[PDB]
RNA sequence: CGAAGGUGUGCUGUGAGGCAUGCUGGAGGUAUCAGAAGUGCGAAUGCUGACAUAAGUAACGAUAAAGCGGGUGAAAAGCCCGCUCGCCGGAAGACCAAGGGUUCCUGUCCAACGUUAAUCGGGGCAGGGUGAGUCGACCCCUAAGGCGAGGCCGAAAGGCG
RNA sequence: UAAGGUGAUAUGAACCGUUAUAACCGGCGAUUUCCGAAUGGGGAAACCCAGUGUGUUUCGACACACUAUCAUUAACUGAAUCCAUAGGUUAAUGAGGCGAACCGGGGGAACUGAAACAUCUAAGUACCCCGAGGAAAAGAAAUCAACCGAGAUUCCCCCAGUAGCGGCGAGCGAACGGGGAGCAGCCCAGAGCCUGAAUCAGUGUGUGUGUUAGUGGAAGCGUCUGGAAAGGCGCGCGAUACAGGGUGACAGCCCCGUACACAAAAAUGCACAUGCUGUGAGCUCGAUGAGUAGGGCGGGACACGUGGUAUCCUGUCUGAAUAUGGGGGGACCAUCCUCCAAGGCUAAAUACUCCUGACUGACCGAUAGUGAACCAGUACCGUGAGGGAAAGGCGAAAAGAAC
């Protein structure tokens, strides 16, 4: 599904509201994108399928650090 | 005159029948509320 | 202990043996009409359970 | 744990046959007993070919309450109450009067 | 190989017919009773051991058990099954 | 030494009602004063059960067709046997696969069923009957098609493969 | 515990036993066919077809055990490609399925009302999915309040149908504070000293109290009507027992029981101490949870419908100081007051009964009461989801009418 790796973003739901307050039922989406990333450590390029603030998040903290978070919560890269 | 029921075992099986039922999980909940009101036959199977 | 536990396995198993012998000899007696007493039955499936039991407490 | 067992004398409170003494001859689990010569019907037995029964009316006990019969104590003539207590270590049955161990 | 208690627990009973009786009288066979998961080795093991006869072939039937009524409620008999020991000339038993 | 209830009589009050009692009935009922209501039925093409009416009327289910002589039986047009008539016969004959699940045979029965009676029947009861190395199913192989290890996708379920 | 029993329609035949392995009741145990999560493969459920290994084998072959998938680990052999990963085999551990209601989340309408109807309401209700527990969730202040102060969270009664929101229409609906039930706070984000400290507890025993079978259990006679006495007429007694039910009409003293006094070979719950495998106390010093708070764009939740709208979360874009700092105090600024988020655990009041035991009802009495007081979710109908009945009473005793 469309769930982001690191971060965890995963389609909400909300509501279209017109100019006479008209609600109907709407989904919003996570911007993902499938990257591939460097690890250094094992030497080998990853996939992921992360969102621009994951990818934000990666740039600021680090691959290992954020590969070592997923390998705790159990995901699979 | 040709009327609606035109009876066969195997294709009365294949669609009503137990392991027809297990799968597409909505006929467990079909076995479970025939369980729960105390069907003596869940299924048409002999 | 019905006389059965103090004794062993092989003596256990031929009793088993001559209990179901006996069984079939009642079960052939009673399919025809000359059997008169049927208690007998109810007594040597009973000891076959005691002695089968006694096997597997041994 | 049971007042009245088959082999005991006992008389008889409320009925038809109110007075009269017997001895009983079985005991059932729907707490009526059966006694000798006390509650008789003239019951009508048909003949069957089976055991070559000719029939006839038949003089036949019925079955009587507990609770409309009760021990009989011959030291006094009258009837009596049963109880239980314990000698050497085992239940045993004796009169509510005078207290004496039915033997 | 077959174990005696099985030999001794597959046999029920006897068949009892005009049938049975022409079929012994004429061709030398005899009809049992027998349980379900019985099968001819077995059967023909049991014969053999048990009753002390030669036997070549057997046949087997299933019996579908009737439907009847005590009063108002139904129910179903069990389906026994039957099966014909022919036994080798020169052998008898009854 | 006869309660509740049922069925009649008499008396009484403006009224809804009350009182006494004959008979059946065979074990509970309840004064006075207060309290709480599933508290009063003639209708709603009201619901359930029972019983009338039309009425002993239509009808008794292809216009292929029956007649007679004997037998059993309480009783026969319809059950059994025999002699004649008629009908289908690319069927209204004989085997089966589907489907039904003892309806197949014998003895016996005539309470309910057969659109009549019935000794008869696919109707009741009891008993018996289905025998495979060569038939089929089981099994090998697959078509359409289904499920689907992992896999892809999907707010869960799940979808595709 | 006991002299009667082999369950009922259901009588019979054939038997066991009567002073203790007859039956019966309880605890501990064994066997526990097949389908069904079904788990060796398959499948039209109670069926078909196997492989491996060890044992029997009168050589016909039989018996037993194992063999699904997923996730977390351990070892060995591993490809594209050399070291190394992917991938594959074996072993261990744990679940997967079912369940009446309660709970927390992920999704989520409309009939209706507004006398139409689209904002709104109905309602985050019905319904779908996931998860876990006897409770769940939440829970220790970046909370309120007002210059006086309260001190976690949960539930009830007031505040109040008030202040407020709202085509200011229909309608929605607080909070501050007070009175109550109940109560205990802690830990990591890090080093050093004392040294196994209180400590949670799954840990092993005994002690006490239950639960799982049970024991004793008081005290009445005559007469009359009457088929039968428990009823009437008289004379007595018990009561820490006159709660109830049955026995031929209404029984305190006929029976089962009841008030009361006792009992466990064996398992098990609850409280205390106990060497008991690991816990980590206490002191000193240091630090204070960053793509986060905030902001822009389009939504939702707070009584609050962007309205001047304060506060929390994020779908996207950006985006700090971080103890001299920051958040909140209903647009906002200044002063003042209060508190330290971006890490977690936590019982008690609180919600419910598919099922167990006891007791009660100004509840019903077979067209009522659960659909079903009776062999009922049965017969029957529909291919199927599903729908769904009708039907109770002889007599005290069958003594159920010999002939
Ligand atoms: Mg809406
Ligand atoms: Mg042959
Ligand atoms: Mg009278
Ligand atoms: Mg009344
Ligand atoms: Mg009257
Ligand atoms: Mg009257
Ligand atoms: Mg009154
Ligand atoms: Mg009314
Ligand atoms: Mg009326
Ligand atoms: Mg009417
Ligand atoms: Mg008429
Ligand atoms: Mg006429
Ligand atoms: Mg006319
Ligand atoms: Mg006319
Ligand atoms: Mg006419
Ligand atoms: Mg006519
Ligand atoms: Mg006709
Ligand atoms: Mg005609
Ligand atoms: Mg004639
Ligand atoms: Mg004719
Ligand atoms: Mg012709
Ligand atoms: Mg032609
Ligand atoms: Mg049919
Ligand atoms: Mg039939
Ligand atoms: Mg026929
Ligand atoms: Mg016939
Ligand atoms: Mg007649
Ligand atoms: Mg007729
Ligand atoms: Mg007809
Ligand atoms: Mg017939
Ligand atoms: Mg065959
Ligand atoms: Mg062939
Ligand atoms: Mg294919
Ligand atoms: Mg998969
Ligand atoms: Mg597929
Ligand atoms: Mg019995
Ligand atoms: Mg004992
Ligand atoms: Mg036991
Ligand atoms: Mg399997
Ligand atoms: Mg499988
Ligand atoms: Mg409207
Ligand atoms: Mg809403
Ligand atoms: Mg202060
Ligand atoms: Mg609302
Ligand atoms: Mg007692
Ligand atoms: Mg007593
Ligand atoms: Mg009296
Ligand atoms: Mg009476
Ligand atoms: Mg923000
Ligand atoms: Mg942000
Ligand atoms: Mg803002
Ligand atoms: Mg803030
Ligand atoms: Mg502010
Ligand atoms: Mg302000
Ligand atoms: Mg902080
Ligand atoms: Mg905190
Ligand atoms: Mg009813
Ligand atoms: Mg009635
Ligand atoms: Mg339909």
């Known amino acids: 599904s469309r769930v982001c790796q690191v971060t965890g973003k995963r389609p909400v739901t909300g509501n279209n509201r017109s100019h006479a307050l008209n609600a109907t039922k709407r989904r919003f989406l996570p911007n993902l994108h499938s990257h591939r990333f460097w690890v250094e450590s094992e030497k080998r390029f990853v996939t992921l399928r992360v969102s621009a603030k994951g990818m934000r998040v990666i740039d600021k903290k680090g691959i290992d650090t954020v590969l070592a978070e997923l390998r705790a919560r159990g995901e699979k890269y | ?46 | ?58 | ?103 | 190989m077959i174990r005696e208690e099985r030999l001794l627990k597959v046999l029920r009973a006897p068949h009892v017919s005009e049938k049975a009786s022409t079929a012994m009288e004429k061709s030398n066979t005899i009809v049992l009773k027998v349980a379900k998961d019985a099968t001819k080795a077995e059967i023909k093991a049991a014969v053999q051991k048990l009753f002390e006869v030669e036997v070549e072939v057997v046949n087997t039937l299933v019996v579908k058990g009737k439907v009847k009524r005590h009063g108002q409620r139904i129910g179903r008999r069990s389906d026994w099954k039957k099966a014909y020991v022919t036994l080798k000339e020169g052998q008898n038993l009854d």
């Open chain 2, 1 to 46: 005159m040709k009327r609606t029921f035109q009876p066969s075992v195997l294709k009365r099986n294949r669609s009503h029948g137990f392991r027809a039922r297990m799968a597409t999980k909505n006929g467990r909940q079909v076995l479970a509320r025939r369980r729960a009101k105390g069907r003596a036959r869940l299924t048409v199977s002999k």
């Open chain 4, 1 to 103: 744990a049971a007042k009245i067992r088959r082999d005991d004398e006992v008389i008889v409170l409320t009925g038809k046959d109110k007075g009269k003494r017997g001895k009983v001859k079985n005991v059932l689990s729907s707490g009526k007993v059966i006694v000798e010569g006390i509650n008789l019907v003239k019951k009508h037995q048909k003949p069957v070919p089976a055991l070559n029964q000719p029939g006839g009316i038949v003089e036949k006990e019925a079955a009587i309450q507990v609770s409309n019969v009760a021990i009989f104590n011959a030291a006094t003539g009258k009837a009596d109450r049963v109880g239980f207590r314990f000698e050497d270590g085992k239940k045993v049955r004796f009169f509510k009067s005078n207290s004496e161990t039915i033997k």
């Open chain 3, 1 to 58: 202990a019905k006389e059965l536990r103090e004794k062993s396995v092989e003596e256990l198993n031929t009793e088993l043996l001559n209990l179901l012998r006996e069984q079939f000899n009642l079960r052939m007696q009673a399919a025809s009409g000359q059997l008169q007493q049927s208690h007998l039955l109810k007594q040597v499936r009973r000891d076959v359970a005691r002695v089968k039991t006694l096997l597997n407490e041994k």
